[PDB]
Amino acid sequence: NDHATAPTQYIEVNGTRYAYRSLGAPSDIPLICFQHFTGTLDNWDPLITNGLSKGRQLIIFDNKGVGLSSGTTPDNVAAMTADALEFITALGIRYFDVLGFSLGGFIVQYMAHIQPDMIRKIIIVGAAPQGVKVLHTFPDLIARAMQLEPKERFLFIFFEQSEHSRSKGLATLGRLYERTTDRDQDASAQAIGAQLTAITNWGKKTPSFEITSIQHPVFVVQGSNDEMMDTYNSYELFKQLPDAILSLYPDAAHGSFYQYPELFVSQTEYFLDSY
Amino acid sequence: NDHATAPTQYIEVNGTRYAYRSLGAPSDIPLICFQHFTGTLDNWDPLITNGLSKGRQLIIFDNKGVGLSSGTTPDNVAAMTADALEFITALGIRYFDVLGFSLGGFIVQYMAHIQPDMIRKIIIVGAAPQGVKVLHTFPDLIARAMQLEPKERFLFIFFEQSEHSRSKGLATLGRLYERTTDRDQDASAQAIGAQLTAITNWGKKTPSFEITSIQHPVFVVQGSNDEMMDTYNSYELFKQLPDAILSLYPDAAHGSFYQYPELFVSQTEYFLDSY
Ligand SMILES: [Cl-]
Ligand SMILES: [Cl-]
Ligand SMILES: [Cl-]
Ligand SMILES: [Cl-]
Ligand SMILES: [Cl-]
Ligand SMILES: [Cl-]
Ligand SMILES: [Cl-]
Ligand SMILES: [Cl-]
Ligand SMILES: [Cl-]
Ligand SMILES: [Cl-]
Ligand SMILES: [Cl-]
Ligand SMILES: [Cl-]
Numbered sequence: 001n002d003h004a005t006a007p008t009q010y011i012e013v014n015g016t017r018y019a020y021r022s023l024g025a026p027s028d029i030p031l032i033c034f035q036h037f038t039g040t041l042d043n044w045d046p047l048i049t050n051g052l053s054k055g056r057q058l059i060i061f062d063n064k065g066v067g068l069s070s071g072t073t074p075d076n077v078a079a080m081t082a083d084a085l086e087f088i089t090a091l092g093i094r095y096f097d098v099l100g101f102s103l104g105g106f107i108v109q110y111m112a113h114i115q116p117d118m119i120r121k122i123i124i125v126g127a128a129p130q131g132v133k134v135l136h137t138f139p140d141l142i143a144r145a146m147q148l149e150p151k152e153r154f155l156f157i158f159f160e161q162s163e164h165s166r167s168k169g170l171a172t173l174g175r176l177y178e179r180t181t182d183r184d185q186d187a188s189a190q191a192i193g194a195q196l197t198a199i200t201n202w203g204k205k206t207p208s209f210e211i212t213s214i215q216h217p218v219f220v221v222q223g224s225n226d227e228m229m230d231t232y233n234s235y236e237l238f239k240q241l242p243d244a245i246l247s248l249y250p251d252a253a254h255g256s257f258y259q260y261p262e263l264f265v266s267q268t269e270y271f272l273d274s275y
Numbered sequence: 276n277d278h279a280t281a282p283t284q285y286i287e288v289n290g291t292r293y294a295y296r297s298l299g300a301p302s303d304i305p306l307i308c309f310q311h312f313t314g315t316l317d318n319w320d321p322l323i324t325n326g327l328s329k330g331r332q333l334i335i336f337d338n339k340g341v342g343l344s345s346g347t348t349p350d351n352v353a354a355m356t357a358d359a360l361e362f363i364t365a366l367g368i369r370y371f372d373v374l375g376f377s378l379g380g381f382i383v384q385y386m387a388h389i390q391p392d393m394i395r396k397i398i399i400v401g402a403a404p405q406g407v408k409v410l411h412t413f414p415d416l417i418a419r420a421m422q423l424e425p426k427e428r429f430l431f432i433f434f435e436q437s438e439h440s441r442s443k444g445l446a447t448l449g450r451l452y453e454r455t456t457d458r459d460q461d462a463s464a465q466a467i468g469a470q471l472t473a474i475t476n477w478g479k480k481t482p483s484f485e486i487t488s489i490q491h492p493v494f495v496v497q498g499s500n501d502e503m504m505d506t507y508n509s510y511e512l513f514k515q516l517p518d519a520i521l522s523l524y525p526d527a528a529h530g531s532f533y534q535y536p537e538l539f540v541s542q543t544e545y546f547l548d549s550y
Contacts, residue, residue, distance in 0.1 A: 007486060224513070224514070227350075235510065235523075238499070238523055238525075239499070242526065243525050243526070243527070244523070244525055245522065245523070245524060245525060245538070246521070246522065246523040247511055247520065247521065247522055248510075248520070248521040249520060250516070250517070250518050250519055250520060251517065251518070262549065263520070263545065263549075263550060266541075266542075266545040266549070267541075267542065268543075270538065270541040270542075274538075274541070275536065
């Protein structure tokens, strides 16, 4: 099954119903994907999920409380990580690669810290380490974005100011139209508030683990100017991690991999299959 | 023909005999490669030249005075660029991609400035823009390397200090053994002195053109700690260029692409064929 056709599946775990999809053929080391702020199953780019599922099983899921997943979204990354782990382990998956975008990129760092032996390789897109000052103003970034209707809100959050970047943003919106049937619910107000809290506190709280201690192979992707996360913080990830490859994409922003999805797939497929 | 079997060819141009090799099948947009400090035809990594010549014609050459090319190597990048252009145009090649490593990475920047319409895409490995302070001390870096016999000199210049990096350096030395037959001459003392002068002055002289004016697609590759060029100067290239992709490779140095040749080929092949 591809992105458009994979059915939404459900699994009950410790009193929570998790909604998920499995793309591609089943494989021994699946890639588990962790979504951005407010995103649901339908915010994944089909070019990326189709492209990466050619070579491995790919799992996309709604964490607790998000979209068609039941329950209450917790207010912190550590709890989101524990919740994700209960889900993944309920599926019987013991060893896997991870791809985290934005908030999801915080979760994969924390997961690698607490459960190193369950993760093989890590992809971080559009994120930052714990403690970064830029996230102290995340609520004000969202207050600015709140004023915008959907297309402008999407371009504001994810794209650069140029016609070149914005047109690739309109292309991404169209790709998100491709799922016609059995679509996810929107995130929910409760989930959005919990995530806003969690993202802000990832920046405000003193780091709780050393980035240098994550020994896994990592592939870090970012655009030239991610306003939310600060592009330089991806260079910081690369400096502090012992085995990270960095890719920076031109004239791009927080939604770098939406801007250049085929470049991302090409790079990521090599990383997972061969690095 | 592959790296090991391609014959050394010669072409007489304006009183100079240029030595070169052509790998792969002839193609409409060849990739012209520009070598590092003291390097000859035999310093190219066969994994890289074989890998990239699967999908395009690849030309490696000795610039004026270097190795089996005749004449006097000039003392500056601008002249090396003019010389390269007389060579490339003598072959009948009017439009081409370029790959420049180290000194060669300075030449491809200058070439894109003076002859933009002859270049399609640009790859820069292990280099820096004009004017960078780190190159003011290039002569002292070479004075330190001068004290070392061949294996240690090679690891000092090209690799990081770890066993992981140094072992990939020993692997590179073995790959450079693969060419058994019809090998190039060494650079020559005159060529080495001219290049040392040229590299130092690329840093000492005020910039003569704006990096921002190079509009071509560029792919910039560097390791985590290039002592010669400063890794941050590759981030500077990425910031200043309008259409550059950056890749930084972990626990690596000035010889980044020797450390991870298959990663480099994978990334570069996509860039040339698809970006
Ligand atoms: Cl986000
Ligand atoms: Cl709950
Ligand atoms: Cl573990
Ligand atoms: Cl910070
Ligand atoms: Cl720690
Ligand atoms: Cl793309
Ligand atoms: Cl060099
Ligand atoms: Cl001459
Ligand atoms: Cl021109
Ligand atoms: Cl400088
Ligand atoms: Cl200029
Ligand atoms: Cl490699």
